[PDB]
């Protein structure tokens, strides 16, 4: 005989992936965010499927549709705010996982890291398209601002922007296209996540120490399944705190006014997850330079494996790199704060210096510091 | 199917019938609780207090 778990094909795949997968025994709670990310993706898919049963993509009926969900669909407010704040939880976990990979040298898993970069881009696109769907003033004007950035691309910017718009400006066509894309993209994200896990399982999972843990591998089923359930429960606590006590904490009030294309909102600012890229974009005076810098901010992650110069994979045993990494985190927080703030004398200079510091820390300071640490260790 | 009509299989059925009955009881209680089946629940004391 044979155990069905180990011999049946689908059960074989499932067992290898999450029941008998050799997992490092010293993985910390920063290794719970990724499974939290998958839970967030599933939760977003379900909540959105239930929302879309009541949402209409025509400009005449979109805002009324969202109001219908909030005030008339049974438990509709729960689903709507679960989706809205789940997007924020999604991006929080995404940033935390990017930080974990940066700090512990998980980017050395080149294929997994690059697939993750692709996933990050796809999720950002999904969030931006979703924000336009409610069709509030913020949705319309933020879409107008962000899409207009593509016009900067030389000799094809205008045609590409008009093709995306479906017309001369953001309008019913753009809303319908964004509803379709917002629906389809998450499943592409799920497939990319499957590829991500495949590539990760090829090489295993890096531990906090940065040293190979083949000696101390523990089964995932009797240990990390319960650890991830606990982490998911904590994340659910936070998300439900948002949904049931501060449903509008992370959202701008202006999106509760129907979009008026003839009057701009007093402040046109993107969602909080996009704010650092917005600050970087505003930092560069030239439009094309701003667009290229915004692209490079996310794409600099691709260059992270090459920039590695330390003889040690993880930053746990490298203090100066730890100081630089925490400087980078503070800089990202500063960029978000600046992107939220109006463009004025105090904020403009701070944003420019912060963008310079972000790129400098990633490209120059970190590798030179790693080399200095290598010399100090006599390596 | 003729393979399973023997004394030993009858013994196995006898051994597992109580556990199968317990699983059926679990399923019935779960169905009543999940669907809030008032036909059964209304007879249940201190739960009839609802509705």
């Amino acid at each position: 005989m044979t155990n069905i778990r180990k011999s049946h094909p689908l059960m074989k795949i499932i067992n290898n992936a999450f029941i008998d997968l050799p997992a490092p025994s010293n993985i910390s709670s920063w290794w719970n965010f990724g499974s939290l990310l998958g839970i967030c993706l599933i939760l977003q898919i379900l909540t959105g499927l239930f929302l879309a049963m009541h949402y209409t993509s025509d400009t005449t009926t979109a805002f009324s549709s969202v109001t219908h969900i909030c005030r008339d669909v049974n438990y509709g407010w729960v689903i709507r705010y679960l989706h809205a704040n789940g997007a924020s939880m999604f991006f929080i976990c995404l940033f935390i996982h990017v930080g974990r990979g940066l700090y512990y040298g998980s980017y050395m898993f080149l294929e997994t890291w690059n697939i993750g970069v692709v996933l990050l881009f796809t999720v950002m696109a999904t969030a931006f398209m979703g924000y336009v769907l409610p069709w509030g003033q913020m949705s319309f004007w933020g879409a107008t601002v962000i899409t207009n950035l593509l016009s900067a691309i030389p000799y094809i910017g205008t045609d590409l922007v008009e093709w995306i718009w479906g017309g001369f400006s953001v309008d019913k066509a753009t809303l319908t296209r964004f509803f379709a894309f917002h629906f389809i993209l998450p499943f592409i994200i799920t497939a990319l996540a499957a590829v991500h896990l495949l590539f990760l399982h090829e090489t295993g999972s890096n531990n906090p120490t940065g040293i190979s843990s083949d000696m101390d591998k523990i089964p995932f089923h009797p240990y990390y399944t319960i650890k991830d359930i606990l982490g998911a429960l904590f994340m659910m606590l936070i998300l439900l705190i948002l949904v049931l006590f501060s449903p509008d904490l992370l959202g701008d009030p202006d999106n509760y006014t129907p979009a008026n294309p003839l009057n701009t909102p007093p402040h046109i600012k993107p969602e909080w997850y996009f704010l650092f890229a917005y600050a970087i974009l505003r930092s560069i005076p030239n439009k094309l330079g701003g667009v290229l810098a915004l692209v490079a901010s996310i794409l600099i992650l691709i260059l992270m494996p090459m920039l590695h110069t330390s003889k040690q994979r993880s930053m746990m045993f490298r203090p100066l790199s730890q100081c630089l990494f925490w400087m980078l985190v503070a800089d990202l927080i500063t960029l978000t704060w600046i992107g939220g703030q109006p463009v004025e004398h105090p904020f403009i200079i701070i944003g420019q210096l912060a963008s310079i510091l972000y790129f400098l820390i990633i490209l120059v300071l970190m590798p030179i510091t790693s080399i200095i640490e290598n010399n100090l260790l006599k390596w | 199917l003729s393979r399973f009509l023997g004394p030993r299989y009858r013994e196995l059925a006898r051994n597992w019938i109580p556990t199968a009955s317990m699983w059926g009881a679990v399923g019935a209680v779960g169905l009543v609780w999940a669907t809030d089946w008032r036909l059964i629940l209304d007879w249940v004391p201190y739960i009839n207090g609802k509705f």
Partner: protein, 53 residues
């Protein structure tokens, strides 16, 4: 107050669900943590001894 009700007709129901969720989380998180500790105690108490020849 009326305008606040209009904007958020689910205000009181949201508050009730929040109270219930806070109590349920207060119950579950310690118990799930206890389950995780129960499973991980075997590793946490593990004593490893290198005994070369």
């Amino acid at each position: 107050t009326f305008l606040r009700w209009a904007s958020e007709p689910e205000h009181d129901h949201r508050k009730r669900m929040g109270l219930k969720m806070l109590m349920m989380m207060g119950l579950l998180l310690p118990l799930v943590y206890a389950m995780k500790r129960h499973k991980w105690s075997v590793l946490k108490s593990r004593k490893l001894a290198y005994r070369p020849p």
